[PDB]
Structures are given as C-alpha cells and as structure tokens.
Symmetry: D2
C-alpha cells in the first residue's frame, strides 16, 4: 500500500519549498500531541477551567518544546509567553489554543486545538515581542477537530489541506486537498442570545437572512458553540460564521492570536474572507498576546454582504 | 477490577424487574451494532441518502433480527415495517433511526442512533399495527451520540442512565445515573432560519429569550443541527430544544415514532417535558409509521413558558 | 452486515440445546474480562508472581461473580475455592488460570487464560467438593490466546470453535469451526532440558522423532514455553505436546483442574487425545483443587505412539 | 505529559551525532509501515507465501521509498535489489525481512520485521553491489516483534534500545534502554528435529546442556519457531539461540543480509556475541544478496562455550 501521511505530505512540499524542514518535525511533534488529546477526549467519562484543559496544554507544550523548532509559545492557557530554552530552540513561534470549547466538553460537543505558526524573524533573544505580528506573517496554521472523527485542517502558503486521523495506525491520512469554500452559502451561524447587544449591521444582516429581500429561501442557522466546529462546517458547506463585537465587549470574545488569526489564514487560503467588520483580521497588528478581536469569516460573497452593510452604516 | 457494563447494569435491574431478560440480549445485540457504527464513523474519510446511512441501517437490523427478542422493526430508512420471521421472533417492537443527521456527517458533526422499544402486546401475527402505539407504551428508549466520545443514554421505566463506550475494551461503561435535568436552563436551541414560518408563540417565546421581560440576562442560543446532539446538550445543561411546526410543514420535521417519541420518554423520565405545543408527544396515537410531529422538549420550567404562550394564543 | 459474535453463536446453540442460557451470560461476563486482559497486556511496558497476574485474576473473578451463573470458582491464583454468595449464585463451577505463562510475559511471548466449566449438580451448599470432578463433566471449556492476535478457542459438547477478537468492535468474531486436528503431525513439543529426568518411554519416543525408524524425515521441534501457545499450535497444525512426569516431580507441572483438564476437553472434542501416559486426563478423579498431572495431548496417532511405548515399558 | 517517542529519541541522539538526520525520517517511514503491519496482523482472521507476506513487503517498501533516505532496498521477498529512483534517493541501503515467520502466522505465534541499515558510501549509481557489505557496516539495525505487545528493538552505534508501541496513540514509547544481555543464561534454543543432521560440536554442546558436566541444573529449552521471537527472548533473559549449519544445508537457513546480520549488530551491541561457529557473522563479506549463514548468538559466555567446542573439534 502507499500514501498517505501528513508528514509524508508536508515533507514532500518542503522539498520543493525547498526547506530545511524543521517545520516538519514541528507538525509531527504537534500531531503526536493531537493524537494524545484525541484519545483522552474519547474516554473522558472513563477517566473522570477543565482538568485536561490543563492537561492538553502542557501536553502540547512538551511536544513543541522538544520539536527543536520553536523559540516562543503562546497558550490561551498561560499568563505570559513561554520561551524555549537554548538547547531546544527553533526558528518558529507557535500560538495555540490547546483545547477550545472545553467550556463545552460535557455535551460530547466537538472540540479542538487551534494553532498558528510564525517564523521568528528577529535576531533578538526571543520574547512575546515575537508573538505579536500580523496574521499575514503565518507560515502555517490550522486546527484539529475532535468530532465524530478526528480531522486536522492544515493551511500553508500553498492552499488548504485536510487530514483525518486513522485511529488504528495512529496516522493522519490526507483525505481532501486543496480545499476551497463555496463562494456563497446557505447558512449563518451566530449566537443570537446577544440580539440585544449586537450592532445595526449584524442586526440588519441576520434580518436579511431570515427574510430574503428578494425573497430567496432564507438561510439556515447553525451554531454549535465550538469555534473549531463552526468554522469547519462553514469551511465545508461554506456559509458564514459570526462572532461580532457587541457593545458590552467591544472586541468580541475570540482571542486573535491563537483563535481568530489562524481561522483567517485558513479561510483566506481557501478562498474565504475574515473581517472584524472594520478590517481584515490578518492585517491587525496586535499589542497584547491575549488580545481579542471580533470575527466575521466564511464564504466570500456572504462576508461581503455583511461588510457592505457595515460600510453602509459607518 | 469491577464494574461496570450496561449489560452488567441492565441485567441487574431486570433481576428485580424481575424479568425474562430478553430485553438484555436486545440492548446487547444493539450495543454491538452501535459499536460497529461508532468505528465506521470515526474513519469515514479513510473509508471514502448517505452510503453508511444504508450501511448502519442494515447493520442495526441484523443485530436486532438475531437478538431473538423482536418481532417488528421500524427504520427511518424503510418504506414499510420489517417483520421478524418465526424462528427469530421476540416480544419486542423496535423503532429506530439508524443514523440521524447523516445529512450532516460531513462536518464531523456529531450524529447518532435513536431507538424506542415497545412490548408487542398483541396476540395477532405481528405487523405495523404493533408499531403504532403511544409513546407511553415504551418499555425502553434512548439514543447513541457518536461525538467526541461515543455515549449512549438509556432511559427505562426507572430513570435515565448514561453510558460511555470505552473504545479499548469495547464496552459501554456506566458513567452517570440516574440523570435528571435542571428544572430551568440558560439556553434555547431552534433553527431560526424559519423565523418567517414560525407561529406567534414560538416567535414571542424566542423574543422573550433575547430580551428578558424582567431583564434577566438573555438565554444562550445553541443549534448544532443534529437532533441527538442537541437534545443531549439540552439533557445535560438543561434548557430547551425546539423544532416546532411551521405553516409550510404543519407537523414539524422530526418523525415521531423513531425520533420524537424516544426523546420524550427520555426527557420526561429525567424530569423534563415534551410537547407539540398542543399535547404531550407521548400521548399521541400514531396512524402512520413514518408520521412526523413538531417537538418542544427540555427543562420543565422553560417548556412550560412556551406552553403558557401557546395557550395564551389559542 | 451480519455475523458473527460468540454470543451470537453460543446463544443460537443453546437455543437448540435447548437451554436456560445462563451459560451465555457466563461466556459474556468472561469475554469482557478477556478483552480487559488483552488490552492490559498489549501495553505492559507503557503501564510498567506478576502484578497483573493478580490483576487479571480478580478481573476475571469479578466478571464471573456478577454473571449470576456461577457458584464456585477456582483460580490457579487462590489458596482455596471462592464461593459465590447467595445473591449472585448460578449453576456453574468455573476453574481457570487467569494468566498462564506470566512467568514468561517478558518475552512478549504469547500468554493466555484457561478455563473449564462444570455444572454443579450437587444440592448441597457449594464448596470445593463441587470443583473436583472428572474432566468428563465439562459442559464447556477452552482458552484465550493473547498472541499476535487475541483468539479464544471454545469447545463444548458439540465440537471445537475458534473466535478472534476484532479489536475495534470489541467483539469475538467466529473465524473457524468446528475445528479438528490432523490425525498425525510433524511436530513434537517438549522441554528437553529435563532429558535427564524423563522416563524411558518419553526418552525412546523423542528418540524415534529425531531418527525415524523407518527413516521418514524427522519431526519438528517446537516449544514456546506457554502452554496455551503450544497446544494451540498443536491444535492447528496438529502434532503433539508433552509435559510428562519426571522423577523429580512425579506428576508433571501443569495443574489438572484449570490447566490440564480443559486442554483435554478441547483436544478430545477436536479429535485429539489427552493422556497422562497411564490414563485419559479426563477420567482422573481429583482430590486436590490445585493437584497437578502430567499431560500428553495432540494428534491422535502420535499420542498413541507414545502410549504404545509406555505400555511397552510397563 | 512528556516523553517519549522513538522519533523524539532518535532525533535527540542524531543531534549530538550530530547528523543530517535523514536517518530519522527513515525510522519514521519505517515505524508507520510497522504500525500498519501490527494492525493487519491482529485481525488476520477477520481479514481472511502468505498474502500479507506480500502485503507487508510492499507496504514497507513504499514507506522506505518515500522516506527520501534510501537508495537501495533488499527484501527477503524480492528476486533482485530494488533501486530507489532519482527523485526519492537517500544515502541509505536498507535490508529487511518484511514478515519473518509467516510460515507460522497461523499459530498466532509471534512474528516480526527484521531490518539493517548501511550507509551507501559508494559514489557509483546504486545497485546490489551496495547491499553486500559486512555486518560491521551497519549504521542502525533492529527488529519488530508483533507479539502480545508490539515492541521494536533498535540498536545503533551507541547501544540497544527497546520501544513498545502504544496502540492508542500510535506511538513507539521507549520502555527500556540501553539493553544488555546477561553474561550467561539458563536457556538453549535450537530445532532438535535435526539432531540427525547437526555436527559434533552442536551435538556435544546440547549434550552438555542437558547433563551438566559439573552437574549444575540443566538448561531450559525454548524454541518458538520465529527467529525474531527467539532472539528477543534470548536478548531479554539471555541464553543462547542456535540455527547452525547441518550437512544437508551447510550454511544454515537464515539469510544473512536481512536476518542474520542485524540480529548480530544487535546482539554484539548489547554485549552478546554472534558466530557461525567459524567466524563473527558480522565480518562475513557477502557475495549473494540472498545468501544464508548459520548463526549462533546470545549470552557471551554460552556462545563461547559452544565455540571452544567447535574449536576443539576442528
Ligand atoms: O524551512 P522549513 O523548516 O522547511 O519551513 C518552511 C515550511 O513552511 C512552508 O512555507 C509552509 O508552512 C513550506 O514552504 C515549508 O515546508
Ligand atoms: O457561548 P458563546 O458566547 O457563543 O461563545 C462560544 C465561543 O467560545 C468558544 O468556546 C471559545 O471561547 C468557541 O468555541 C465558541 O465560538
Ligand atoms: O422481560 P424482560 O425481557 O426482562 O424485559 C423487561 C425489561 O424492561 C424493563 O421494564 C425496562 O426496560 C425492565 O423492568 C426489564 O429489564
Ligand atoms: O436543518 P433543520 O431543518 O434545522 O433540521 C435538522 C434536524 O434534522 C435532523 O438532522 C434529522 O432529520 C436532526 O438531527 C435535526 O434536529
Ligand atoms: O442451560 P444453559 O445455561 O443454556 O447451559 C447449557 C449450555 O451448555 C452446553 O451444553 C454447551 O456448553 C449447551 O448445550 C448449552 O448452551
Ligand atoms: O518452563 P517449563 O518447565 O517447560 O514449563 C512451562 C509451562 O509452564 C507454564 O508456563 C504454566 O506453568 C505453561 O505455559 C508451560 O507449559
Ligand atoms: O546523518 P543522519 O541522517 O543523521 O544519520 C546518522 C545516524 O546514524 C547513527 O550513527 C545511528 O544510526 C546516529 O549517529 C545518527 O543519528
Ligand atoms: O522451522 P525451522 O527449520 O526451525 O526454522 C525456523 C526459522 O525460520 C524462520 O521462520 C525464518 O525462516 C525463523 O523465524 C525461524 O528461526
Ligand atoms: Mg483552551
Ligand atoms: Mg478557547
Ligand atoms: Mg437515518
Ligand atoms: Mg434522521
Ligand atoms: Mg496464573
Ligand atoms: Mg499457569
Ligand atoms: Mg518475509
Ligand atoms: Mg523469514
């Protein structure tokens, strides 16, 4: 038998890259941590803010620490930036959310790990300074969906690729590439509990989805509650996902460095779009490692519609 | 080591039941089919209306056919009712949805199997006639959530019990019992794409959730798109789930026999409620095996609120 | 898909048996314990007279204790016979070796669980008295080989059947039945370290295997060191297995109740033979629960050859 | 959590090596193929000279072919040497036995993959010429035991290390290092069916093991029938393993390049010894890729004893 492995896939690409490939042992060190996570999660009740939320976070760090490719780490789970010591230093800064949606593990709701990889280009000894660059400085990014199946969407400068983990061989087999997203969708996904809090554009948009001006049949609504779940659905059947700013929290809820920025690199890399409503999520220069941002991503056409609105209203 | 297995759990209950226990080899024949399903689904991309949708449906029938406990089967996937031939006949009629949400497998969205078990009490040779009884005639019912973990909630006359499948030992280990649902929740889950189509009560209700009359902070909104997913979330953190009638399809979308009725037996058995808005889902006498019904279930208090509305408006 | 499960297989046989089937929940309670064992063993180094040797022994007892089919248990790992208390009593006495060959786990040598099941026919409150009957009083017996694959050979009054555990579905799928053993083999398996200790027959036999009197090409020699491994090889390619008496230990080394007797029920049930050299292992009336016996089993023709010798010499 | 992975282990060693590390993606490409093999084998009966014997052989080649580290491959399963084409060429020549002991898979006997890695040092376009070097030119070698657990012993210039595959995470976790073998053992393992065929030394040796001249208690005898099984036992509890020349086949049965040579690199690297009786297996310059050699390996002291004999007799 032949083909295929992520590793077998990444390396073959970094050949023509043509690269020193430490990127490869990074995604490897990463996959292992992902495989460990995937197994822990399918047996949460047999194993008895969440415990593993801690558990994964380390788990992931330790694999990254020992990949010999990283020099600065950012975990949605750490006060400050973790610096890789001199023996194990690599040329990569990796931002990640060890386990997104643990606030909702209990529903056997799908959850996942989000990551972004920047090449530290500084010559200075590493520090947070290196972890605050624009999204557009991503060499590689993606996530890991621990759903009915454990997938991993990886986007790199070339395009978007999907890998499903075959539990038995403990390998991530490439099952789709290079993914691209329908130009227009039939779905809007947003937490409408905040109807009260939303701005006019969002309000008018949603309105436009429920009652088509032209009267086309109305969009669907899906909101799972797990970002990595929602986007991916969005990335597959297209559509749009919204976690916009609300007056109470002006900058949304999703952390840009490890949550918003990556989903964007992916979205844009698959033909999608990612905006705050005010600007491309990716061109935002961050000042705070844990700073948040509102986010509107998905099918290029739908995202525009919203934008035209936001523009209309500003 | 000791404890625990469903089987080890059911049998111990049918002892004081005190029963002939064929119910037991039914849930066994069932679990096997569930374990087969769970594995197929975690490797859908490596395996390449849905193919398995057929696959599971048989798979499930064959295990039930050979449980020697069943005499009539109803699959959301079959024109007519399947009758178990004389050699393999049991005293049970089992209604089920082999794989709910396959219309959404592609998102590694959680999916599942829903089932209901009636004791054929007739003395007539079996037929569909036996599969159309009120929900209240359920000896046992529940579902199987193939999410990040593969759980199985089983409700029986006594109460509601939850089992997580430990992948390694291929066993369903009891991880929660006897489940009961918060009396009031912080969530409403409904497809709002149909805002246009909904009736006044539903409309006014949702309105009341977004902007609290008393001004309590508004509910959350979650809609995953997979019934078995949504309810279970509902059953765990409580709340409410709605797939109400809309003028276009006056009786909702979810099939009562294999989808609505079971979720109700469960809901009510855990302290919840299940109404069409007009009546308890369970007291509906069905005329058509594949007949549908609208459904409002979840936290007892929330469900009432809606009801008081429906009453208010009728 | 359809077929096949042990359970699905045993039950279908106890139907025409036609039985009350508690035998079934016994092999079920058993299989679970076997599945637990199989998993522990494939990860012994990751888990860090042997520890599990204890572990399995309980594990097995607890499943048997709760099968509600047993009333007296014999473990190569217990000073006295375990009596099942009144609430959980069944009509079966089960003799077993939780984990044979743990003295050799370290070589990732194959190891296994050996069991025998007698129907207590007494009307007396149960006790060891019930666990000491002739082999010929076995209702069911077999073993579990935890090798490259985890098989389970089960022999019952009808014939011999083999089941391989499919790790994924946690089910024992029937892969061979009804097994029968070549009438003559090309192999002898015996620990020749004891050349010094062996009697003349054994000595002359072995001699006859290395240098054919007629000059046919000599037998093979295989000795793995794990009884359950050796016999099964013997049962598959036929041949003969010997652990005969030696002057130092006149009655061999293998314990009759849980080790020798079962292998015999199996052997004879597959067309093989099992002798001490003096008599059929099965007709021996035991006085001591932990009493041993020498054992010569395998291809009917080979076993005879040895016997004719033993006879020749006595 | 932290530690440990082979990869995580090899790479850390090739750092101080300090190497270009393609050796690493070789053992990786290798492990994958090993994981694929391990799974196929534990479900041989559910999957229905051997079929997989072919299957593995390719499987292994394809992973090696795509490791980008190899330039010439030798499979006990191929007429001639496989040359890696220009795009995928690496600086390594890898000799291997895809699946040793398939002649004995049927007994759920343990089986395995044996490999040896030479650095092609030639400047010539690659060919078999490169695959025929002395054992002493091994950069890395080892095997994979698919027994009750799936281990992998890897020996490299530094010492011998053992890795057990944790089925769940699909990772080879280091469980022992750096292995060394008892200086003397209590076991001899040899196929005595060939008593007739053996030479005087072998004969006298065995004789000396059954009846101690000094009268120490006699050795044990173990012969599993699977080389990778037997040696490893030998490597763990020490002892000695013999597959010596017999007049009928003067050069033994085990193929030096892929079977004998590696077991030696390992043995000697763990403090053991490996001789034909005439010379160190490792210093033999091969002329034929598929050429065989007799082999005597194991505890240093025991091996000598035999040697002193061979010397005594020549
Ligand atoms: O130099 P490295 O370690 O190969 O990293 C660069 C990698 O990043 C990429 O730009 C995509 O992530 C590839 O071109 C290449 O594989
Ligand atoms: O419950 P809310 O306010 O809609 O926020 C849910 C969001 O939070 C997360 O759980 C992470 O904070 C995401 O998975 C999801 O998009
Ligand atoms: O007679 P049976 O086959 O045991 O079935 C009855 C079972 O149904 C129950 O009412 C619950 O499903 C239990 O009392 C009992 O285990
Ligand atoms: O997409 P809609 O119209 O909200 O319906 C989704 C419903 O359909 C189902 O997929 C089954 O028909 C359920 O899982 C879910 O509740
Ligand atoms: O009465 P039970 O519980 O079915 O046990 C008897 C079983 O034993 C057998 O003799 C074989 O073990 C079968 O005839 C039958 O399945
Ligand atoms: O090492 P010896 O003396 O040959 O005995 C090995 C025997 O002991 C056992 O390990 C059980 O006592 C069997 O598996 C095997 O037949
Ligand atoms: O140059 P490479 O690709 O790292 O290969 C050399 C490897 O071989 C070794 O000699 C052992 O196999 C190590 O020193 C080193 O890891
Ligand atoms: O059956 P024999 O002649 O002892 O040879 C067995 C040998 O053959 C092999 O199966 C490989 O040829 C080895 O595993 C084992 O050492
Ligand atoms: Mg987190
Ligand atoms: Mg998060
Ligand atoms: Mg269906
Ligand atoms: Mg459905
Ligand atoms: Mg034991
Ligand atoms: Mg034993
Ligand atoms: Mg081979
Ligand atoms: Mg071979």
């Amino acid at each position: 038998t032949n083909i295929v492995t992520l590793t077998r896939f990444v390396k073959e690409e970094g050949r023509k890259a043509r690269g020193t490939g430490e990127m490869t042992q990074l995604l490897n060190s990463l996959c292992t941590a992902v495989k460990a996570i995937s197994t822990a999660v399918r047996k949460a009740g047999i194993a008895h803010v969440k415990k593993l939320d801690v558990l994964s976070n380390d788990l992931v760090i330790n694999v990254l620490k020992s990949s010999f490719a990283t020099c600065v780490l950012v975990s949605e789970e750490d006060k400050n930036a973790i610096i890789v010591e001199p023996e194990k230093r690599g040329k990569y800064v990796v931002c990640f959310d060890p386990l997104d949606g643990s606030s909702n593990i209990d529903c056997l709701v799908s959850i996942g790990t989000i990551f972004g990889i920047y090449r530290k280009n500084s010559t200075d000894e590493p520090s947070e300074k290196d972890a605050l660059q624009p999204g557009r400085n991503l060499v590689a990014a993606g996530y890991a969906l621990y759903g009915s199946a454990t997938m991993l969407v990886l986007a790199m400068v070339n395009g978007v690729n999907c890998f499903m983990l075959d539990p038995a061989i403990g390998e991530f087999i490439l099952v789709d590439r290079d993914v691209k997203i329908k130009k227009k969708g039939s779905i809007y996904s947003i937490n409408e509990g905040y109807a009260k809090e939303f701005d006019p554009a969002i309000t008018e948009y949603i309105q436009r989805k429920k009652f088509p001006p032209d009267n086309s049949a109305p969009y669907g609504a899906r909101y799972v509650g797990s970002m990595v779940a929602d986007v991916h659905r969005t990335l597959v059947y297209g559509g749009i996902f919204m976690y916009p700013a609300n007056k109470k929290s002006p900058k949304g809820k999703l952390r840009l460095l490890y949550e918003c920025n990556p989903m964007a690199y992916v979205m844009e890399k698959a033909g999608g779009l990612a905006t705050t409503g005010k600007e491309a999520v990716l061109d935002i220069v961050p000042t705070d490692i844990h700073q948040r941002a509102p986010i509107i991503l998905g099918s290029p056409e739908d995202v525009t519609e919203l934008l035209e609105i936001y523009q209309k209203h500003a």
